[PDB]
Paper text:
To understand the role of the essential Pol epsilon modules during DNA replication, we studied the structure of a truncation mutant of the yeast tetrameric complex, lacking the dispensable, flexibly tethered N-terminal catalytic domain of Pol2 (hereafter, deltacat). To mitigate this problem, we incubated our preparation with 0.01% of crosslinking agent glutaraldehyde for one minute on ice, before cryo-grid making. We determined a 3D structure of the deltacat core based on 161,372 particles, to an average resolution of 4.45 Å (4.3 Å in the core and 5 Å in the periphery), revealing a compact assembly of dimensions 100 × 90 × 60 Å. To interpret the map, we have docked a recently published structure of human C-terminal Dpb2 bound to the Pol2 C-terminal zinc-finger appendix, providing an unambiguous fit. Docking of a Pol1-based homology model of C-Pol2 into the cryo-EM density required splitting the polymerase into three domains, which were used in independent rigid-body fitting and subsequent real-space refinement. The resulting structure shows a polymerase fold with jaws spread wide open. In agreement with the notion that certain elements are only flexibly tethered to the deltacat core, no density was retrieved for the N-terminal domain of Dpb2, nor for the histone-like subunits Dpb3-Dpb4. For example, the C-terminus of Dpb2 intimately contacts C-Pol2, explaining why a truncation of the last six amino acids in Dpb2 prevents Dpb2 binding to Pol2-Dpb3-Dpb4 and results in a lethal phenotype. Likewise, a so-called ZnF1 element in the Pol2 zinc-finger appendix emerges as the organizing center of the deltacat core, explaining why cysteine-to-alanine single amino acid changes in this region can alter the essential non-catalytic Pol epsilon core, hence abolishing cellular growth. Furthermore, inspecting a more complete Pol2 structure that extends beyond the conserved polymerase module revealed that the C-terminal zinc-finger appendix occludes the DNA-binding groove in the dead polymerase fold.
Hetero-tetrameric Pol epsilon plays a key role in replisome maturation and origin activation. Pol2 is the catalytic subunit, with the N-terminal half containing DNA synthesis/exonuclease functions. The C-terminal half of Pol2 (C-Pol2) has been predicted to contain a second polymerase fold, which has become inactivated during evolution, and is followed by a zinc-finger appendix. Notably, the catalytic domain of Pol epsilon is dispensable for viability (though cells are sick), while the non-catalytic C-Pol2 is essential.
Author numbering: 170 to 194, 207 to 233, 266 to 367, 378 to 402, 405 to 490, 502 to 556, 598 to 665, 667 to 688
Write the structure that this text describes.
């Protein structure tokens, strides 16, 4: 039972002939960039093969001139209306002129989909019957076909220990606390005062401090107050550490986790530096600084935490709600199904963002949708929503019974 370090995690590469991963383990390489999407295509390929209306490459159809296939590819774009599609065997412009597809989750670019139709080589523009997304299977059969290795950290698989589930179903002593959170307002101080008031009595176990610790970003340019974004943020930490030290009931038996948001000093992202967490590391002894995103090494489960604006980007890019969002992220099996010219993902840690296999719980702290918790093929996906303008609301999750309770003060 630990917290997985993204900068210190392993790496696994897939082989289609052996259908398995190899012992892979500063700046990345070119091969990483190429094999990034290559690994994506072959992973989706094998994922399709696990589900056994046929299979055909682009070169097979372009070699002909007549027809009739459900092609696989990325909804990319070269020119206006020149929505091209690419597999590792050729490129082809596709059109959806007067198409009545299904009611998919959220069709977005940079996504590998399946479209049926005919070529019509006179203009060589493939037509679409219906656009569909690659289906995602349950975690049971998924973990059945992964093989016999370790994908979370313990190397083979030995999860046949009923004592794990029994002790978790009995030791209710380990509770998770989830609260956007700024630091330079009296309202924040008040909220934290009543929150810790609820926390000094009942000892929690794992604190999850969300991102966006400041209303403003970095890149300071005015030395009016003889300060900068760094110094201001440092003093904000000092104030938080002082309120934290006002009540020493905490850190006695509760572990904490910081998570950097989008406005602190491009994915993935290393945590808040030690130079700004010096005093809190001195006062406390149960601190950690995980990258965004990260995974909690839970003894029998795969919980992943990722804070970003998911709903705020899908609506600004569809061609022509909450379950649509969750359905999209789980079916594509990836956290950022977006082009690299849109969200620059670091070449080294693309595997970290990969949802191979299906995780147990994805903590998606959205900053533009309400708080919820729903199920979709088993993985209970949550959202705590905002924290201040929603009249001070927060969440508490039970891992054993998987209970989800909301707690509001106003």
């Amino acid at each position: 039972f630990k917290v997985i370090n993204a900068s210190q995690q392993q790496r696994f590469s897939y082989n289609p002939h052996k259908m398995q991963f190899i012992f892979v383990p500063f700046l990345p390489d070119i091969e990483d960039k190429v094999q990034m999407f290559l690994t994506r295509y072959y992973l989706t390929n094998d994922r399709v093969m696990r589900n056994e209306n046929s299979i055909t490459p682009i070169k097979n159809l372009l070699g002909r001139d007549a027809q009739n296939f459900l092609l696989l590819g990325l909804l990319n774009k070269n020119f206006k209306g020149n929505w091209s599609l690419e597999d590792p065997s050729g490129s082809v412009e596709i059109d959806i002129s007067q198409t009545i597809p299904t009611q998919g989750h959220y069709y977005v670019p940079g996504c590998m989909v399946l479209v049926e139709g005919i070529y019509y080589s006179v203009g060589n523009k493939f037509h679409v019957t219906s656009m569909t997304l690659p289906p995602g299977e349950r975690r049971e059969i998924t973990l059945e076909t992964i093989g016999n290795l370790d994908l979370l950290g313990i190397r083979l698989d030995k999860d046949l220990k009923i004592r794990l589930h029994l002790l978790e179903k009995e030791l209710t002593d380990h509770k998770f606390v989830i609260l956007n959170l700024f630091l330079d307002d009296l309202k924040i101080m008040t909220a934290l005062s009543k929150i810790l008031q609820k926390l000094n009595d009942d000892p929690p176990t794992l604190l999850i401090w969300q991102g966006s610790f400041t209303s403003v970003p970095v890149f300071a340019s005015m030395s009016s107050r003889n300060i900068s974004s760094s110094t201001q943020f440092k003093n904000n930490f000092d104030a938080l550490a002082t309120l934290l030290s006002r009540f020493d009931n905490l850190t006695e038996n509760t572990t904490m986790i910081f998570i950097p948001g989008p406005n602190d000093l491009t994915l993935p992202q290393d945590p808040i530096p030690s130079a700004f967490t010096k005093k809190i590391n001195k006062v406390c002894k149960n601190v950690v600084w995980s990258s965004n995103p990260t995974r909690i090494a839970y003894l029998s489960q795969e919980i992943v935490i990722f804070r970003d604006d998911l709903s705020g980007r899908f609506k600004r890019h569809r061609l022509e709600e909450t379950r649509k969002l969750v359905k999209t992220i789980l079916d594509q099996g990836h956290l950022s199904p977006f082009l690299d010219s849109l969200r620059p993902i670091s070449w080294d840690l693309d595997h970290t963002l990969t949802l191979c296999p299906i995780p147990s719980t994805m903590v998606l702290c959205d900053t533009t949708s309400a708080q919820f918790d729903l199920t979709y093929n088993g993985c209970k996906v949550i959202n705590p929503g905002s924290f201040i303008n929603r009249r001070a609301r927060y969440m508490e999750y039970v891992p054993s019974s998987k209970k989800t309770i909301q707690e509001e003060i106003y």
